[PDB]
Write a protein that binds this DNA or RNA. Structure first.
Ligand SMILES: Nc1nc2c(ncn2[C@@H]2O[C@H](COP(=O)(O)OP(=O)(O)OP(=O)(O)O)[C@@H](O)[C@H]2O)c(=O)[nH]1
Ligand SMILES: Nc1nc2c(ncn2[C@@H]2O[C@H](COP(=O)(O)OP(=O)(O)OP(=O)(O)O)[C@@H](O)[C@H]2O)c(=O)[nH]1
Ligand SMILES: [Mg+2]
Ligand SMILES: [Mg+2]
Ligand SMILES: [Mn+2]
Length: 664
DNA sequence: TTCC
């Protein structure tokens, strides 16, 4: 049923994805690589003392703090939703092999029994209403750019200077490029404006995955992660094969002579896509304004910040269901892409821009090196973009696409199983927009708070509430998928945006509170996703600019956790056994050092002014700028701090571009 | 060296 066209790096189609410069060329050639990460300055993830520490701490915590999650996934008690064996990984060493990204997910979706388009006219209206509400009255904003991020295909530059030029150029010729694409002249578009080509596969680490201890064997067991081989990938599942990547770390001994203590495994590898910047720029220029709108006007269901911010909304519900979507990104329906594009045209968006947007969502992917002796293959023909990979992470709006899909999906899941008496309110676009608008503002007896696949569905006192309970029960029994669109189920240990929803004996939304996830504190502090890159001189360009700062926001971020104090003590203790030092002291010094260093980057900061002026969010973002791409928004961060991490383009240049794009 |  149509196998995807594939080309070797030697092929001219692949060659053209990389500019005639060192960086680009190395990216294309880059072979498989692995190695211990520098968890903290001067400390390797595989250091014996460290692993030892990790072994004792994980075991002890898991033993003294077993999970407290009821038959309904509600977490009560100690707030622990699972064991602590997640830290038992050799950070820096991936499972082998990584997956080959699927060129088409149509079959994957069908076999999963998911619809190939809106199933009812209502649903069709709702999705289209979602588009109208989201992309309507948008205000221009400067186009911010992450510092030290790669522009990827074709240049692979990191120079903010070059990035800015690249972007500004894009906004100027985006229009001419799009028209080119409307004429089906993709190659011209790519050659003249670098808008097209492919996504460059980058492999992010999931430093902590499921690991269990078999009471029978006394042996540890790492959760299997299925991965598709090249055949499977190019045939959408028709041929080839799916299988568990190997997480066994024994190899480390024989290969690198690294001592591997029993019960430690290789890291899980998530695949990510680096989009061609010339293309994502014009998209990001619209995406941000869309973000601002829904985070403002529809803040009830979309703008979340503090544990209490969340708490307020959820407390007023009679029922709160914590949903969960499996492999959201690879399942994301191509039809939604096309629907959104069609509706945007209707709303009056420039055809060329919509074409750009559409193309960005069906572009080919260049696979680097999923494993030793593997990779360097371009999937899909750049000349005529026709892939269906679902959401492509590096695209300029993957969060909006995910939200647009899941928010409506959840609303529908509610209508379908709990509120048919509302169906009559949705008869046409107008009535639909009106309903959806009211709904997103939290003004109906059914509600939701969400971000892509993570969400909490609520029910106030009313007709729908008895239905909610049946739904939740359907989810518990889990034998029937409540949606025709994605595969939904309840989250075991319900949590939202990193905060666990803590129930008491009542087991009701009103007598509940949001607390940080304790395991996440552990994950972050001992299993970071990247090392400290002490080699990169510019800290603002590192994946972890100021690691030591996280200590300052810790009490704030996790203090509320039921076993906070206990864990800190357990750590302090085990760290002592392992290093003969105070962990507290260690982090305290790191803290002082980084606070001093930070001032060298923050203007307004006296060349030694404390963290007095900084907020907890500021600190967490400075230690992990990644969180700025999912947990928080530019608006939730101190202006002077956001400047350290991001750099923008003239509000004028974007404002002018945005004007030629929007309808009104 | 390698995404939002
Ligand atoms: N641009 C980008 N978005 C990411 C990245 N990682 C997670 N996301 C966001 O998170 C969503 C995917 O949710 P995850 O929980 O990470 O994974 P999943 O594919 O849904 O499935 P699980 O593996 O079962 O959790 C997407 O909608 C993205 O917007 C990443 O590296 N880059
Ligand atoms: N957009 C984005 N989201 C990320 C990224 N890393 C973690 N996340 C968020 O975290 C989710 C699962 O990714 P994990 O890395 O397992 O999460 P974690 O914060 O380490 O901890 P858990 O909540 O216990 O899974 C995603 O659904 C994202 O929303 C990242 O690089 N980009
Ligand atoms: Mg998920
Ligand atoms: Mg997840
Ligand atoms: Mn959740």
């Amino acid at each position: 049923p149509r196998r995807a066209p594939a080309f070797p790096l030697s092929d001219i189609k692949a060659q053209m994805l990389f500019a005639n410069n060192i960086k680009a060329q190395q990216a294309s050639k880059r072979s498989f690589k692995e190695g211990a990460i520098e968890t903290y300055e001067g400390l390797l993830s595989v250091d014996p003392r460290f692993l030892s520490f990790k072994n004792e701490l994980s075991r002890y915590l898991t033993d003294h703090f077993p999970a407290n999650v009821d038959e309904y996934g509600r977490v009560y008690g100690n707030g622990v939703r699972t064991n602590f064996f997640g830290m038992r990984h050799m950070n820096g060493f991936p499972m082998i092999p990584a997956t080959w990204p699927l060129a088409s997910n149509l079959k994957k979706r069908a076999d999963a029994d998911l619809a190939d388009g809106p199933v009812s006219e209502r649903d069709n209206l709702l999705f289209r209403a979602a588009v109208r509400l989201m992309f309507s009255d948008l205000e221009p904003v400067p186009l911010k750019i992450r510092k030290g991020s790669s522009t990827c295909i074709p240049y692979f530059s990191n120079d903010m200077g070059t990035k800015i030029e690249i972007a500004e150029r894009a906004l100027e010729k985006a229009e001419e490029a799009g028209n080119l694409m409307l004429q089906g002249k993709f190659d011209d578009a790519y050659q003249l404006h670098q808008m097209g080509g492919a996504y460059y596969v980058v492999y992010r680490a999931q430093s902590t995955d499921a690991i269990t201890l078999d009471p029978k064997t006394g042996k540890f067991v790492s959760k299997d992660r299925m991965v598709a081989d090249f055949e499977y990938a190019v045939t959408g599942g028709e041929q080839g094969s799916l299988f568990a990547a190997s997480k066994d770390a024994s190899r480390l001994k024989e290969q690198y002579g690294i001592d591997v203590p029993d019960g430690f495994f290789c890291e899980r590898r998530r695949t990510a896509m680096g989009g061609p910047f010339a293309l994502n720029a014009p998209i990001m220029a619209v995406a941000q304004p869309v973000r601002n709108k829904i985070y403002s006007k529809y803040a009830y269901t979309f703008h979340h910040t503090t544990r209490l911010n969340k708490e307020e909304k959820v407390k007023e519900w009679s029922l709160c269901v914590a949903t969960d979507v499996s492999d959201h990104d690879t399942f994301w329906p191509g039809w939604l892409r096309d629907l959104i594009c069609d509706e945007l045209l209707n709303m009056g968006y420039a055809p060329w821009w919509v074409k750009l947007f559409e193309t960005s969502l069906k572009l080919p992917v260049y696979v680097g090196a999923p494993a030793p002796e593997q990779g360097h293959t371009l999937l899909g023909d750049p000349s005529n973009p026709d892939l269906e990979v679902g959401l492509s992470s590096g695209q300029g709006a993957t969060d909006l696409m995910g939200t647009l899909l899941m928010s409506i999906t959840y609303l529908v899941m509610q209508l379908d199983h709990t509120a048919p008496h509302l169906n009559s309110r949705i008869k046409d676009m107008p009535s639909a927009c009106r309903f959806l608008d009211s709904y997103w503002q939290g003004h109906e007896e059914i509600r939701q708070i969400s971000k892509s696949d993570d969400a909490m569905l609520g029910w106030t006192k009313g007709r729908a509430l008895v239905g909610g309970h049946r739904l939740f029960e359907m989810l518990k029994e889990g034998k029937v998928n409540p949606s025709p669109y994605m595969k939904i189920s309840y989250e075991h240990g319900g949590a939202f945006l990193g905060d666990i929803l803590l129930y008491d004996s009542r087991r009701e939304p009103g007598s509940a509170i949001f607390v940080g996830n304790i395991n996440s504190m552990l994950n972050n502090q001992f299993s970071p996703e990247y090392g400290v890159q002490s080699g990169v001189r510019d800290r603002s360009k590192r994946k972890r600019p100021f690691p030591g700062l996280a200590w300052a926001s810790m009490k704030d971020t996790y203090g509320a956790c039921p076993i906070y104090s206990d864990v800190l003590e357990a750590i302090e203790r085990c760290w002592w056994n392992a290093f003969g030092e105070s962990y507290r002291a260690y982090r305290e010094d790191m803290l002082k050092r980084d606070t001093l260093e930070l001032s060298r980057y923050v203007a307004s900061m006296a060349r030694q002014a404390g963290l007095a002026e900084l907020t907890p969010i500021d600190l967490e973002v400075l230690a992990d700028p990644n969180k700025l791409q999912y947990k928080w928004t530019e608006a939730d961060v101190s202006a002077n701090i956001h400047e350290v991490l991001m750099h923008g383009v003239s509000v004028e240049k974007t404002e002018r571009f945005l004007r030629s794009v929007m309808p009104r």
